[PDB]
Amino acid sequence: HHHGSRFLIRLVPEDKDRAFKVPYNHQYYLQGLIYNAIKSSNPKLATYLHEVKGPKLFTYSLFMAEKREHPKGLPYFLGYKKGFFYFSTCVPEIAEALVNGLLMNPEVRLWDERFYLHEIKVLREPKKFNGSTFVTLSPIAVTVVYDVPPMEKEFYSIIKDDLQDKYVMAYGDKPPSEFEMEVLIAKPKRFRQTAWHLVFRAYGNDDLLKVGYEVGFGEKNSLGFGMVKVEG
Protein backbone atom coordinates (compact mmCIF):
# COMPACT_ATOMS: atom_id res chain seq x y z
CA HIS A 1 0.00 0.00 0.00
CA HIS A 2 2.66 2.50 -1.14
CA HIS A 3 2.06 5.57 -3.19
CA GLY A 4 3.97 8.83 -3.27
CA SER A 5 3.09 11.92 -1.19
CA ARG A 6 5.19 14.91 -1.72
CA PHE A 7 4.67 18.25 0.18
CA LEU A 8 5.98 21.71 0.12
CA ILE A 9 5.87 23.17 3.65
CA ARG A 10 5.99 26.94 3.98
CA LEU A 11 6.84 28.59 7.30
CA VAL A 12 6.61 32.28 8.02
CA PRO A 13 8.81 33.89 10.66
CA GLU A 14 7.11 35.15 13.87
CA ASP A 15 7.22 38.73 12.57
CA LYS A 16 6.44 38.90 8.83
CA ASP A 17 9.14 41.63 8.40
CA ARG A 18 12.69 40.84 9.46
CA ALA A 19 15.46 38.72 8.12
CA PHE A 20 15.68 35.19 9.54
CA LYS A 21 18.97 33.35 9.53
CA VAL A 22 19.41 29.90 7.96
CA PRO A 23 22.61 28.03 8.97
CA TYR A 24 24.38 26.48 5.92
CA ASN A 25 24.47 23.28 7.86
CA HIS A 26 20.87 22.90 8.98
CA GLN A 27 20.25 19.18 8.24
CA TYR A 28 20.22 18.32 11.81
CA TYR A 29 17.75 21.11 12.85
CA LEU A 30 15.35 20.21 10.00
CA GLN A 31 15.65 16.57 10.93
CA GLY A 32 14.67 17.36 14.56
CA LEU A 33 11.60 19.16 13.27
CA ILE A 34 10.45 16.29 11.06
CA TYR A 35 11.19 13.56 13.70
CA ASN A 36 9.46 15.69 16.42
CA ALA A 37 6.29 16.14 14.25
CA ILE A 38 6.08 12.37 13.75
CA LYS A 39 6.94 11.39 17.37
CA SER A 40 4.21 13.81 18.43
CA SER A 41 1.35 12.47 16.19
CA ASN A 42 2.35 8.86 16.21
CA PRO A 43 4.92 7.59 18.82
CA LYS A 44 4.46 3.96 17.80
CA LEU A 45 5.40 4.85 14.22
CA ALA A 46 8.35 6.98 15.30
CA THR A 47 9.68 3.98 17.40
CA TYR A 48 9.26 1.70 14.42
CA LEU A 49 11.23 4.18 12.34
CA HIS A 50 13.94 4.55 15.01
CA GLU A 51 14.55 0.77 14.99
CA VAL A 52 14.17 -0.15 11.30
CA LYS A 53 17.50 -1.11 9.63
CA GLY A 54 17.76 0.11 6.04
CA PRO A 55 16.09 3.10 4.25
CA LYS A 56 13.10 4.55 6.09
CA LEU A 57 11.28 5.43 2.88
CA PHE A 58 11.19 9.16 3.21
CA THR A 59 13.40 12.18 2.42
CA TYR A 60 13.24 16.01 2.40
CA SER A 61 15.12 18.70 0.94
CA LEU A 62 17.22 21.54 2.12
CA PHE A 63 15.41 24.42 3.90
CA MET A 64 15.10 27.28 1.44
CA ALA A 65 13.95 30.92 1.61
CA GLU A 66 12.06 33.34 -0.63
CA LYS A 67 14.67 35.63 -1.97
CA ARG A 68 18.02 35.00 -0.39
CA GLU A 69 21.01 37.12 0.60
CA HIS A 70 24.43 35.71 1.40
CA PRO A 71 26.84 37.56 3.75
CA LYS A 72 30.65 36.91 3.53
CA GLY A 73 32.17 34.03 5.58
CA LEU A 74 29.15 33.75 7.90
CA PRO A 75 27.69 30.32 8.95
CA TYR A 76 24.19 31.39 7.77
CA PHE A 77 22.36 33.11 5.00
CA LEU A 78 19.48 35.56 5.39
CA GLY A 79 15.99 34.85 4.24
CA TYR A 80 12.91 36.91 3.89
CA LYS A 81 9.11 36.48 3.88
CA LYS A 82 8.89 32.62 3.88
CA GLY A 83 10.97 29.52 4.72
CA PHE A 84 10.17 26.26 3.07
CA PHE A 85 11.18 22.69 2.50
CA TYR A 86 9.86 19.60 0.68
CA PHE A 87 9.25 16.27 2.16
CA SER A 88 8.41 13.01 0.31
CA THR A 89 7.52 9.51 1.25
CA CYS A 90 5.88 6.39 -0.09
CA VAL A 91 4.45 5.41 3.34
CA PRO A 92 1.02 7.00 3.84
CA GLU A 93 1.34 6.69 7.76
CA ILE A 94 4.51 8.71 7.66
CA ALA A 95 3.08 11.42 5.52
CA GLU A 96 0.01 11.62 7.80
CA ALA A 97 2.11 11.65 11.03
CA LEU A 98 4.26 14.43 9.58
CA VAL A 99 1.42 16.73 8.53
CA ASN A 100 -0.63 16.24 11.73
CA GLY A 101 2.51 16.64 13.82
CA LEU A 102 2.95 20.02 12.13
CA LEU A 103 -0.84 20.79 12.79
CA MET A 104 -0.88 19.55 16.39
CA ASN A 105 1.71 22.30 16.55
CA PRO A 106 2.04 25.35 14.30
CA GLU A 107 4.63 27.31 16.24
CA VAL A 108 8.00 25.90 15.10
CA ARG A 109 11.43 26.39 16.47
CA LEU A 110 14.31 25.99 14.12
CA TRP A 111 17.94 26.70 15.21
CA ASP A 112 17.62 30.09 16.79
CA GLU A 113 14.36 31.16 14.99
CA ARG A 114 10.61 31.22 15.60
CA PHE A 115 8.40 30.30 12.67
CA TYR A 116 4.80 29.63 12.23
CA LEU A 117 3.36 26.88 9.92
CA HIS A 118 1.93 28.85 7.03
CA GLU A 119 0.82 26.32 4.31
CA ILE A 120 1.26 22.88 3.22
CA LYS A 121 1.19 22.46 -0.58
CA VAL A 122 0.58 18.87 -1.85
CA LEU A 123 2.41 18.21 -5.25
CA ARG A 124 1.23 16.17 -8.24
CA GLU A 125 3.56 13.30 -9.12
CA PRO A 126 4.75 13.06 -12.85
CA LYS A 127 3.09 10.35 -14.85
CA LYS A 128 6.44 9.16 -16.05
CA PHE A 129 10.15 9.66 -15.42
CA ASN A 130 12.19 7.74 -18.17
CA GLY A 131 14.11 10.47 -19.88
CA SER A 132 13.44 13.57 -17.67
CA THR A 133 16.09 15.71 -16.23
CA PHE A 134 16.20 15.78 -12.42
CA VAL A 135 17.73 18.39 -10.13
CA THR A 136 18.65 17.49 -6.57
CA LEU A 137 16.51 19.32 -3.79
CA SER A 138 18.81 17.90 -1.18
CA PRO A 139 22.35 16.60 -2.23
CA ILE A 140 23.08 12.92 -2.98
CA ALA A 141 25.47 11.00 -0.65
CA VAL A 142 27.19 7.75 -1.89
CA THR A 143 29.71 5.96 0.35
CA VAL A 144 31.40 2.60 -0.22
CA VAL A 145 32.54 -0.08 2.26
CA TYR A 146 34.62 6.50 1.76
CA ASP A 147 32.99 9.18 -0.52
CA VAL A 148 32.24 8.03 -4.10
CA PRO A 149 32.40 10.90 -6.64
CA PRO A 150 29.91 11.00 -9.57
CA MET A 151 32.96 11.06 -11.87
CA GLU A 152 33.81 7.52 -10.65
CA LYS A 153 31.48 4.75 -11.99
CA GLU A 154 30.79 2.92 -8.73
CA PHE A 155 28.63 6.05 -7.95
CA TYR A 156 26.10 4.70 -10.33
CA SER A 157 25.99 1.03 -9.38
CA ILE A 158 25.78 1.93 -5.72
CA ILE A 159 22.72 4.29 -6.52
CA LYS A 160 21.23 1.56 -8.74
CA ASP A 161 21.42 -1.19 -6.11
CA ASP A 162 20.03 1.06 -3.39
CA LEU A 163 17.04 1.88 -5.65
CA GLN A 164 16.68 -1.83 -6.18
CA ASP A 165 16.98 -2.39 -2.33
CA LYS A 166 14.16 0.30 -1.83
CA TYR A 167 12.16 -1.32 -4.53
CA VAL A 168 12.37 -4.68 -2.80
CA MET A 169 11.43 -2.97 0.59
CA ALA A 170 8.62 -0.90 -0.99
CA TYR A 171 6.98 -2.29 -4.17
CA GLY A 172 6.53 -6.00 -3.33
CA ASP A 173 9.60 -7.99 -4.46
CA LYS A 174 12.25 -8.57 -7.30
CA PRO A 175 13.45 -5.32 -8.82
CA PRO A 176 13.62 -4.00 -12.43
CA SER A 177 17.12 -3.86 -13.93
CA GLU A 178 17.21 -1.11 -16.58
CA PHE A 179 18.97 1.93 -15.15
CA GLU A 180 21.00 4.81 -16.31
CA MET A 181 22.05 8.23 -15.04
CA GLU A 182 23.62 10.93 -17.22
CA VAL A 183 25.00 13.63 -14.84
CA LEU A 184 24.75 17.12 -16.52
CA ILE A 185 26.18 19.18 -13.61
CA ALA A 186 27.85 18.02 -10.36
CA LYS A 187 28.84 20.33 -7.48
CA PRO A 188 30.08 19.06 -4.11
CA LYS A 189 29.13 20.40 -0.70
CA ARG A 190 30.45 18.94 2.55
CA PHE A 191 28.78 18.74 5.93
CA ARG A 192 30.60 16.51 8.53
CA GLN A 193 31.15 13.92 4.55
CA THR A 194 30.60 15.14 0.96
CA ALA A 195 27.23 15.11 -0.83
CA TRP A 196 26.49 16.24 -4.41
CA HIS A 197 24.17 18.67 -6.06
CA LEU A 198 23.29 17.10 -9.42
CA VAL A 199 21.39 17.92 -12.53
CA PHE A 200 20.89 14.64 -14.31
CA ARG A 201 18.84 12.88 -16.83
CA ALA A 202 17.72 9.33 -15.90
CA TYR A 203 16.68 6.46 -18.06
CA GLY A 204 15.33 3.04 -17.59
CA ASN A 205 12.63 1.29 -15.65
CA ASP A 206 9.79 3.87 -14.69
CA ASP A 207 8.88 2.16 -11.33
CA LEU A 208 12.49 2.05 -10.27
CA LEU A 209 12.91 5.68 -11.15
CA LYS A 210 9.61 6.51 -9.25
CA VAL A 211 11.24 4.89 -6.24
CA GLY A 212 14.09 7.29 -6.34
CA TYR A 213 11.77 10.20 -6.93
CA GLU A 214 9.55 9.26 -3.81
CA VAL A 215 12.18 8.26 -1.24
CA GLY A 216 15.41 9.70 -2.40
CA PHE A 217 18.50 8.69 -4.50
CA GLY A 218 21.57 7.44 -2.74
CA GLU A 219 22.02 7.23 1.06
CA LYS A 220 20.90 8.88 4.39
CA ASN A 221 17.60 9.96 2.87
CA SER A 222 16.01 10.19 6.34
CA LEU A 223 18.72 12.74 7.23
CA GLY A 224 17.65 14.96 4.39
CA PHE A 225 19.75 13.71 1.43
CA GLY A 226 19.05 12.79 -2.20
CA MET A 227 15.67 14.38 -2.72
CA VAL A 228 15.05 15.22 -6.32
CA LYS A 229 12.52 17.05 -8.48
CA VAL A 230 11.90 17.22 -12.32
CA GLU A 231 13.90 20.27 -13.63
CA GLY A 232 11.89 23.44 -14.56
Pick the CATH number of 129-232 from 3.30.70.1900, 1.10.15.40, 3.40.50.1820, 3.40.50.150: 3.30.70.1900
Dihedral sign (CA 11, 227, 136, 142): positive
Is 2 within 8 Å of 91 (Cβ atoms)? Answer: yes
Evaluate whether 1-128 and 129-232 have a shared fold.
yes
Sheet holding 133-136, edge to edge: 179-190, 194-204, 133-136, 228-230
Q: Which of 3, 24, 48, 50 is catalytic?
A: 50
Is 65 within 8 Å of 80 (Cβ atoms)? Answer: yes
Is 161 within 8 Å of 168 (Cβ atoms)? Answer: no
Q: Which of 29, 35, 76, 80 is catalytic?
A: 35
What resolution in angstroms does the PDB record give? 2.2
Q: Where are the domains of the chain?
A: 1-128, 129-232
Instruction: Please confirm, yes or no, whether 35 is among the known catalytic residues.
Output: yes
Query: CATH class for domain 1-128?
Result: alpha beta
- CB hemisphere CA count around 201 (13 angstroms): 6
Burial 114-140 (b: 16+ CB within 10 A, else e): ebebeeeeeeeeeeebeebebebbbbb
Q: Is 57 left (phi over 0), alpha (psi -120 to 50) or beta?
A: left
SS3 letters across the chain: CCCCEEEEEEEEECCCCCCEEEECCCHHHHHHHHHHHHHHHCHHHHHHHHHCCCCCCEEECCCEECCCECCCCCCEEEECCCEEEEEEECCHHHHHHHHHHHHHCCEEEECCEEEEEEEEEECCCCCCCCCCEEEECCCEECECCCECCCCCCHHHHHHHHHHHHHHHHHCCCCCCCCEEEEEEEEEEEECCCEEEEEEEEEEECHHHHHHHHHHCCCECHHHCCCCEEECC
